[PDB]
Design a protein around this nucleic acid. Structure first.
Ligand SMILES: [Mg+2]
Ligand SMILES: [Mg+2]
Ligand SMILES: [Mg+2]
Ligand SMILES: [Mg+2]
Ligand SMILES: [Mg+2]
Ligand SMILES: [Mg+2]
Ligand SMILES: [Mg+2]
Ligand SMILES: [Mg+2]
Ligand SMILES: [Mg+2]
Ligand SMILES: [Mg+2]
Ligand SMILES: [Mg+2]
Ligand SMILES: [Mg+2]
Ligand SMILES: [Mg+2]
Ligand SMILES: [Mg+2]
Ligand SMILES: [Mg+2]
Ligand SMILES: [Mg+2]
Ligand SMILES: [Mg+2]
Ligand SMILES: [Mg+2]
Ligand SMILES: [Mg+2]
Ligand SMILES: [Mg+2]
Ligand SMILES: [Mg+2]
Ligand SMILES: [Mg+2]
Lengths: 194, 138, 132, 77, 101, 49, 328, 85, 538
RNA sequence: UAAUCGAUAAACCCCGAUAGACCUUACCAACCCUUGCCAAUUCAGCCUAUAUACCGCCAUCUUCAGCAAACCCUAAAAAGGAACAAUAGUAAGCACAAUCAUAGCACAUAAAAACGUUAGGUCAAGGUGUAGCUUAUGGGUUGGAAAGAAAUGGGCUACA
């Protein structure tokens, strides 16, 4: 007892909302898409293959769930979760005066069962030496204390931490190194007099 | 005609802890084909425009990795077959974000990421100054 | 003469599908890849871990759907969950279709420690592109 | 996500000098243990307990092989 | 079963190398330094030699996963040059295509 | 773990959920071989007996 | 297959309405370019062959031209040239010959009456008129054609055009005429720019053998070239490299009349000189009139150099040098 | 050793050697027989060597109005089915 | 369900069977996973999802009695075997080890219960709090509350307080036992309630839920204490769940048949209930919506049927009704009303939204479609509803096709709907003759359909197919077709009509003979008029 | 020598091998185990023979254009099938061509090159029909697999 059903194309409404049809990622089932679309290399006397039984149409990623109307409807519902950016920091010049420390953090995503990526542990710290309270002696000591991690032309000190397994451990290690560098650039020891 | 009523009930609370600030959020979307990356660029730019982020998008140069293998099975080294792997890059450059705004944008961006592409997220976290360095003398 | 991934031309009566009608020198030109994931990108890793699962999925699905598989599987890999798009002939009754889809959606998930989606598209017969 | 590393911090990974107290301070054992500690402190692939066991292994090996250190001509404990 | 007896023995070699990964790492530290006196290093050579043969990582041979081919195998996919082509030409591997330039 | 792969597929073939065409081919060929009369000898009688 | 195409029409129309609903644009203002953009966004297939991409067009655009029914229900064919194999081509040939004979008779009567009122409309050189190729005749006459028959038809059209033309036959021939675009290869001349109180300013870009060069030229300064912050003599110690630099200036007699700054990256010692030569030539177009630009492009300064290094092939040494082939 | 297995079509194509290089000119015909047997002719999907009865494949879904659990045939019933096949 | 049409369910039984087959597949996979755990011990996911790990049904320790019990209680017969093995070596079991063992028996599992219960009290002085939680919950399904009533007194004498779950069961235990007296049993529940507050334990939601659940099966006039305890619940500050209103509505439905005044009480309490977003925190919240729309469907109240439909989607559209057997009844009684109070536009707007999407009608619902179309005289949608009825009600087709075709005889036949009139009749009549009793009423329908369409050729062929079916329709059809034939001037059909009618002796053959005489006079066939008289005389 | 194998005219000779101290390693000499990787199997396992049975993969003619289903014709037909001012040829299809890639065109390069020839190479990538091993042609440990009288192919260094 075989039974063949006409697809949803004959029942699709002209003004039906498409986010209701394709809310999330789908394998592009041809019975749910009333759009007659032909994908494939044509034959000399033939035409490109229709949507039924077409493997090329299934291979490609479908963005039917990301139509502009659906994107509008989704983004409107997300406005309640976001917070407003302060207008007092529109230009970088005041951002450098108020928050001079920059923390470069890397986040990664990959398809598979695994999450752990060894490149995620690296944390970068960038601080401008023109926004600190170093004097001449402590500055000239700090330059030689850091070495090549300070850019003389741009006047930025970079601290790249990898030694800690976790991102938070790398971060608090980096702030500890910044504090220790600041404190040790101030102490004048016996051997500095020679 | 049959539309359900009272469909919305989220759990949103505002904590007293100051929100984290970000200066630049770089997104590097790597893929194999250009059409998927172009459609994703359109989607991401439009979604950022509704949220009011003022994204700037540029395309980093592609990377092609080629290698060479034998053509036959037992003995033929004069004849070879060369295989290619193309990697195309798209740069979504975001500025002037907060911790929660970045979280919601990344939600709507990663939850709908395609299968054949990957993303690299580089956040530039803002911080004024730590505590033992503000104005101390040892 | 090249012979890799090529079905030879008969007297003019063999039915050949679109995937088999194109030589491997047409990949990414006329036909696409049967599997998509991130391990084959440039700065990514874990390619072999996904390749072995890909081969095992091809063989397992071929054995699970005997004689009713029209074309090769389409293995999508998107955020920890892998989707299997299959083209199946309408040889089995829907009662036996629904047993196997539910069986696979849990056996594969428990064997790969990752969510698995299975989508079936039923075709009346094998669709012929070139001569038949 | 899902990996807390026993709630350890950066001082439990970088600073392992607290595990070197029962060793000769002025001997070559300190010269070798400081390189061992520096190598372990730049190791993000291991947890704190594994480094503790690594130090304890050298500990017990050196405390077991006592005749060789006294025969080598250097006073070691 | 496994593909081949050579693969069977290679799996055992890998397992025992992982089992003795820490011990060999600790013994090699006593041999690869100049600070310690040579008198203990000559005994360190003896205990590192007393370990079983298949424990060293040198005996590990990188073969193919499917056909266990000892040579002509790419490291990225752990696949032989023949099975890799057999899969890529069928198109079961993403991003892989014939090079034309 | 090829042992897990092979054992799992064999067990599902025996319980009738996976169908291994290669193993069916091997079984049919071995049955034809044993019917024609050249089978696998018992352990311990091939050489002496 | 007429009913199948008729059903494809309604399916395409309802799909167009649904696509407009999906995109949120007005279906009344929704056009084919919008269909193309919508398909390119919804189905982003990355394939090098554009014909393999998903396409949704009008069925008369997708499907080829189908032959109409050649006979009625009584079996009698409609056209009287059906049994000739190519009814359309032979009808075209018959009509052309009938009009040729009509023109011949009319011109004979006009010559008998001593009336010459026709003109020569055969020369359409300023319009750029050409004859249809076999493909353009095959899309009109749906059945297949032959090269010799196409040549016969063209040669008959020439005979028709070589005669005094009236009103109707000129229009009949005009539908077998195609207009060509202007093959004028004149380049675009960059307008002279004035930047920050500086007169006689222009810029040029050149590229030769993986070497990119930008030249900034001032027409009001003295003759000198500053390459990458240093002098051209220091940057190009080789005489030939400086001869390359003098080649554009000496041709236009602008040696000591222009001050130029060159910035070149990539390539070797001679590749940079060639790229700077090309960029300088492309930049000096603004300071000269039009008649010298053509002399310069005919001397070879305005044409790029596609001579690039060929990729090495497997089994060979230098992409041409093969291995030592032993006969035995 | 599961990845070393192939498709029955590929097995038969090598077993019969219908496309052999020696059979082209006419060197063959010495043993003039080429028979290929389909192994999935009378193979019901749910049946196995263990004799398990699955509600979706072998036995119907519902009996007496109640759901059927996973069953297994007895030793002698399985032998009767084996004799039939 | 899969979206492919070959896998999309067509009827409700097919949907249920497909869901059950899918579930059989999943637990068949789970059986393999549990039976062969070593094939799934390898972990690949870094977060280490625990739901994908295989489960083990074996005890960890076998020799130690104190360790075997705690495994075998949570993992039926093995639980009793563990106790039998533990008591063999004279191992002392505390009041905590055997409490869970007794709970294991109380959950799964008459004569073995007494043997187990003797091991509960005689072997060890166990705590009453762990004794009643097994006993009182066991004998309720064992159908013997008289000994639970004794353990209540034992607990009262042993100075230990009784928890809420004690009175949750004791009131029902004393309520179900009735012998010609119900007032004494109710007074016992009242005495237990008044002791409940004295025993310093607050009466929970489920206590007043059960006291109300007890009152429905005995008295139809017992709603006064039901309303009193309903208000007593609100007086304390506990928001009642859905079943608390459901039992009140059930008894009000029982009293609703003789007097319709209680329907308004149901409506006014429902109006106050539907003012908030609810949460199903009680397992017995499934029957509430069934009762709350059966009350509206019996009394034909769409104005509140809409509000009951709006009540469920306020909190959650799905977490309120458990089984599909009840959701089918839900939608059938909703659309029974919706079809014929409100306008046909609303009926058709909800038809495409409830019928093919959520669930497929039962046999009751399909008749309401016909009754809705007939009252408003809607004919353009009859072929539209029939094509869906073909796929949905094939099981009921043999018993319901008779009433789908009478609507055509009540309305007129416009000259624009002849194709729709022909297609449905052709599809109906071409299937039954290829296999399905054929009633004689459909011939009277096809004749009138083709009369105004002017197609006598197709009308004549189908008439004889039933005359050859060993059964003859009424003579009114024969007269109507005779009028049709004389309109088209076809006297050749009338002779074969009368010859095959008079032989089977129709009751209106006397008028059939007059009509053929008139037709023959009109068409100038008097020779044949006399010839047929000779034939009928012979 | 106790010590692999295959390729070995164009189309082998820095070829399998984008790779040998034990491993790899299939070779040999000494020693050990024989339902011996798997849930089970009068079963596993064999780099045992047959590439002159194969599939999978390639070389060659070959940047040659032909191969070919369904038809039709010849005063018979083994076979052939063309005259453009045209004398029996229509012809789906596979090739070629076109297209695609080397991110703008053109050119060029790459790629592609059908049916078949060489019983061409590969039972040793892998599975395999047939014929053969089963206390051994199977499975483990250790040690060795030289050396050049001599000839030759391909490269590097130079002879300035
Ligand atoms: Mg093998
Ligand atoms: Mg060279
Ligand atoms: Mg050799
Ligand atoms: Mg040889
Ligand atoms: Mg040769
Ligand atoms: Mg050895
Ligand atoms: Mg060796
Ligand atoms: Mg051997
Ligand atoms: Mg050969
Ligand atoms: Mg040709
Ligand atoms: Mg012939
Ligand atoms: Mg042809
Ligand atoms: Mg191009
Ligand atoms: Mg070209
Ligand atoms: Mg080539
Ligand atoms: Mg070509
Ligand atoms: Mg040979
Ligand atoms: Mg050979
Ligand atoms: Mg073999
Ligand atoms: Mg051999
Ligand atoms: Mg030599
Ligand atoms: Mg060579």
């Amino acid at each position: 007892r075989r039974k063949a059903l006409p697809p949803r194309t004959e029942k699709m409404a002209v003004d039906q909302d498409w986010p209701s049809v394709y809310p999330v990622a789908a394998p592009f089932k041809p019975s749910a898409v009333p759009l007659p679309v032909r994908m494939g290399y044509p034959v000399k006397r033939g035409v490109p293959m229709a949507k039924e039984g077409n493997l090329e149409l299934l291979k490609i990623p479908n963005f039917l769930h990301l139509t502009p109307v659906a994107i509008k409807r989704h983004c409107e519902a997300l406005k309640d979760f976001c917070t407003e950016w302060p207008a007092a920091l529109d230009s970088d010049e005041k951002c450098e005066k108020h928050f001079p420390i920059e923390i470069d953090t890397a986040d990664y995503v990959s398809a598979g069962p695994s999450i752990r990526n060894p490149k995620a542990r690296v944390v970068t710290l960038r601080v401008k030496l023109s926004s600190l309270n170093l004097d001449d002696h402590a500055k000239k000591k700090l330059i030689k204390l850091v070495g090549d991690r300070y850019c003389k032309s741009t006047d930025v000190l970079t601290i790249k931490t990898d030694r800690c397994p976790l991102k938070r451990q790398n971060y608090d290690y980096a702030v500890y190194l910044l504090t220790v560098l600041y404190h040790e650039s101030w102490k004048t020891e016996e051997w500095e007099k020679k | 005609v049959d539309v359900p009523k009272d469909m919305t009930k989220p759990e949103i609370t505002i904590s007293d802890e100051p929100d984290t600030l970000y200066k630049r959020l770089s997104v590097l979307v790597k893929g194999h084909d250009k059409a998927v990356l172009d459609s994703y660029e359109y989607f991401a730019v439009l979604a950022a425009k509704e949220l009011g982020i003022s994204i700037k998008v540029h395309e980093p140069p592609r990377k092609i990795e080629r290698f060479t293998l034998l053509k036959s099975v037992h003995i033929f080294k004069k004849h070879r077959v060369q295989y290619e792997m193309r990697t195309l890059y798209r740069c979504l450059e975001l500025e002037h974000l907060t911790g929660s705004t970045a979280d919601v944008y990344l939600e709507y961006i990663q939850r709908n990421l395609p299968e054949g592409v990957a993303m690299e997220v580089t956040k530039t976290k803002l911080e004024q100054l730590p505590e033992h360095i503000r104005k101390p003398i040892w | 003469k090249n012979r890799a991934a090529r079905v030879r031309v008969s007297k003019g009566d063999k039915p050949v599908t679109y995937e088999e009608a194109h030589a491997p020198h047409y990949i990414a030109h006329r036909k696409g890849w049967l599997s998509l994931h991130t391990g084959n990108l440039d700065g990514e890793d874990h390619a072999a871990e996904r390749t072995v699962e890909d081969v095992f999925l091809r063989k397992f699905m071929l054995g699970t759907f005997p004689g009713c598989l029209a074309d090769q599987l389409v293995l999508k890999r998107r955020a920890n969950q892998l989707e299997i798009c299959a083209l199946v002939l309408r040889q089995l009754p829907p009662h036996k279709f629904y047993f196997l889809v539910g069986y696979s959606e849990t056996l594969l998930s428990h064997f790969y420690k990752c969510p698995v989606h299975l989508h079936l598209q039923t075709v009346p017969s094998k669709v012929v592109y070139k001569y038949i | 996500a899902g990996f807390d590393d026993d709630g350890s911090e950066f001082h439990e990974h970088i600073f392992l000098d607290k595990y070197l107290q029962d060793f000769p301070k002025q001997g070559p054992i300190r010269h070798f243990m400081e390189l061992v500690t520096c190598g372990l402190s730049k190791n993000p692939y291991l947890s704190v307990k594994q480094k503790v066991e690594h130090i304890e292994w050298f500990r017990n090996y050196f405390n077991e092989k006592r005749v060789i250190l006294k025969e080598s001509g250097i006073q070691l404990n | 079963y496994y593909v081949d007896w050579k693969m069977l023995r290679d799996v055992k070699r890998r397992k025992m190398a992982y089992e003795y990964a820490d011990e060999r790492l600790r013994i090699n530290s006593l041999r690869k330094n100049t600070i310690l006196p040579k008198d203990l290093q000559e005994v360190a050579d003896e205990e590192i030699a007393s370990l079983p043969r298949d424990s060293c990582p040198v005996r590990i041979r990188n073969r193919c996963v499917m056909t266990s081919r000892p040579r002509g195998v790419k490291r990225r996919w752990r696949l032989s040059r023949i099975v890799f082509r057999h899969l890529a030409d069928h198109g079961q591997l993403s991003g892989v295509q014939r090079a034309m330039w | 773990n090829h042992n897990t792969y092979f054992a799992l597929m064999g067990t599902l073939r025996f319980l009738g959920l996976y169908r291994d065409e290669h193993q069916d081919f091997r079984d049919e060929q071995l049955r034809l071989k044993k019917l024609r009369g050249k089978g696998k000898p018992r352990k311990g009688e091939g050489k002496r007996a | 297959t007429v009913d199948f195409i008729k059903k494809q029409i309604e399916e395409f129309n309802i799909g167009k309405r649904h696509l407009a609903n999906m995109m949120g644009e007005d279906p009344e203002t929704f056009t084919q370019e919008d269909i193309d953009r919508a398909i390119a966004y919804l189905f982003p297939s990355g394939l090098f062959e554009k014909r393999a991409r998903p396409i949704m067009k009008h069925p008369e655009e997708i499907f080829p031209k189908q032959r109409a029914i050649q006979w009625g229900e009584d079996g009698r064919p409609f056209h009287f040239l059906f049994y000739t194999g190519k009814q359309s081509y032979y009808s075209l040939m018959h009509d052309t010959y009938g009009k040729l004979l009509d023109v011949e008779k009319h011109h004979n009567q006009l010559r008998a009456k001593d009336l010459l009122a026709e003109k020569t409309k055969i020369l359409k050189d300023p319009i750029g008129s050409r004859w249809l190729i076999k493909e353009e005749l095959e899309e009109m006459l749906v059945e297949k054609l032959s090269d010799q028959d196409y040549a016969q038809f063209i040669r008959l059209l020439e005979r028709l055009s070589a005669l005094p033309c009236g009103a109707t036959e000129e229009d009949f021939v005009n539908r077998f005429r195609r207009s060509i675009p202007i093959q004028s290869k004149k380049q675009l001349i960059e307008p002279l720019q004035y930047d920050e109180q500086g007169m006689a300013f222009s810029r040029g870009e050149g590229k030769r053998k993986t070497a990119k060069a930008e030249v900034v030229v001032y027409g009001q300064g003295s003759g000198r070239i500053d390459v990458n912050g240093v002098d051209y003599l220091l940057y190009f110690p080789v005489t030939q490299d400086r001869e390359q630099l003098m080649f554009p200036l000496h041709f236009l007699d602008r040696l000591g009349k222009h001050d130029m700054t060159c910035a070149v990256s990539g390539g070797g010692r001679s590749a940079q000189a060639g790229a700077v030569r090309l960029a300088m030539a492309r930049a000096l177009c603004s300071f000269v009139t039009e008649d010298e630009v053509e002399w310069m492009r005919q001397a070879g300064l305005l044409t790029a150099d596609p001579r690039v290094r060929e990729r090495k092939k497997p089994g060979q040494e230098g992409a041409r040098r093969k291995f030592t082939w032993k006969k035995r | 050793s599961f990845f070393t297995k192939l498709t029955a079509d590929e097995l038969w194509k090598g077993a019969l050697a219908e496309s052999g290089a020696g059979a082209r000119k006419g060197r063959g015909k010495r043993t003039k027989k080429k028979r290929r047997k389909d192994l999935n002719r009378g193979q019901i999907i749910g049946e196995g060597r263990h004799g398990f009865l699955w509600p979706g494949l072998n036995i119907p879904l519902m009996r007496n109005g109640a759901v059927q659990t996973i069953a297994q045939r007895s030793k002698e019933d399985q032998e009767k089915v084996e004799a039939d096949m | 369900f899969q979206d492919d049409p070959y896998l999309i369910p067509t009827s409700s039984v097919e949907s249920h069977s497909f869901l059950l087959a899918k579930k059989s597949g999943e637990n068949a996979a789970k059986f393999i996973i549990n039976s062969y755990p070593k094939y799934f011990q390898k972990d690949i996911a870094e977060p280490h999802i625990p739901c994908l790990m295989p489960e083990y049904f074996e005890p960890q320790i076998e020799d130690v009695s104190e360790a075997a019990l705690q495994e075998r209680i949570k993992l039926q017969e093995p639980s009793a075997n563990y106790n039998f093995q533990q008591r063999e070596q004279s191992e002392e079991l505390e009041e905590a080890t055997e409490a869970d063992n007794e709970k294991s028996k109380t959950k799964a599992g008459t004569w073995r219960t007494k043997n187990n219960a003797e091991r509960i009290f005689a072997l060890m002085p166990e705590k009453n709090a762990h004794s009643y939680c097994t006993m009182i919950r066991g004998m309720v399904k064992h159908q013997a509350p008289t000994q639970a009533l004794n353990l209540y007194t034992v607990l009262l004498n042993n100075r230990l307080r009784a928890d809420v779950y004690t009175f949750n069961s004791l009131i029902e235990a004393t309520a179900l036992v009735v012998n010609e007296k119900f007032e004494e049993k109710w007074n016992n529940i009242l005495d237990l309630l008044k002791q409940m507050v004295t025993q310093n334990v607050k009466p929970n939601l489920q206590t007043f839920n059960t006291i109300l659940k007890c009152l429905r099966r005995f008295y139809a006039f017992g709603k006064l204490p039901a309303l009193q305890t309903l208000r007593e619940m609100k007086a304390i500050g506990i928001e009642p769940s859905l079943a608390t209103y459901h039992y009140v509505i059930q008894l009000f439905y029982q009293h609703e048949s003789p007097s319709k005044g209680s329907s308004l009480i149901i409506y006014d309490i429902m109006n106050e209930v539907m003012g908030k977003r609810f949460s199903p925190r009680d397992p017995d919240d499934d029957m509430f919506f069934q009762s709350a729309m059966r009350v509206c469907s019996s009394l034909r109240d769409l104005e509140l049927a809409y509000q009951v439909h709006g009540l469920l989607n306020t909190g959650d559209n799905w977490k309120l009704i458990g089984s599909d057997h009840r959701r089918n009844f839900y939608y059938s009684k909703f659309f029974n009303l919706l079809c014929f109070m409100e306008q046909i536009d609303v009926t058709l707007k909800w038809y495409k939204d409830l019928i093919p999407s959520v669930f497929f009608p039962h046999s009751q619902t399909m008749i309401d479609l016909l009754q809705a179309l007939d009252v408003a005289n809607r004919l353009d949608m009859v072929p539209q509803i029939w094509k869906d009825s073909k796929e949905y009600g094939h099981t009921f087709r043999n018993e319901l096709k008779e009433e789908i075709l009478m609507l055509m005889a009540r309305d007129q036949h416009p000259p624009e709907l002849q194709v729709a009139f022909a297609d449905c009749a052709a599809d109906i009549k071409s299937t039954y003759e290829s296999q399905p009793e054929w009633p004689a009423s459909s011939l009277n329908y096809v004749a009138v359909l083709f009369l105004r369409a002017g197609r006598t050729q197709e009308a004549w062929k189908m008439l004889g197919l039933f005359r050859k079916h060993n059964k003859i329709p009424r003579a009114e059809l024969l007269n109507e077709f005779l009028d049709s034939a004389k309109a088209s001037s076809s006297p050749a059909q009338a002779i074969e009509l009368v010859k095959l009618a008079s032989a089977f002796s129709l009751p209106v053959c006397e008028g059939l003979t007059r009509r053929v005489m008139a037709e023959f006079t009109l068409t100038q066939e008097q020779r044949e008029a006399l010839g047929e008289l000779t034939a009928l005389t012979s």
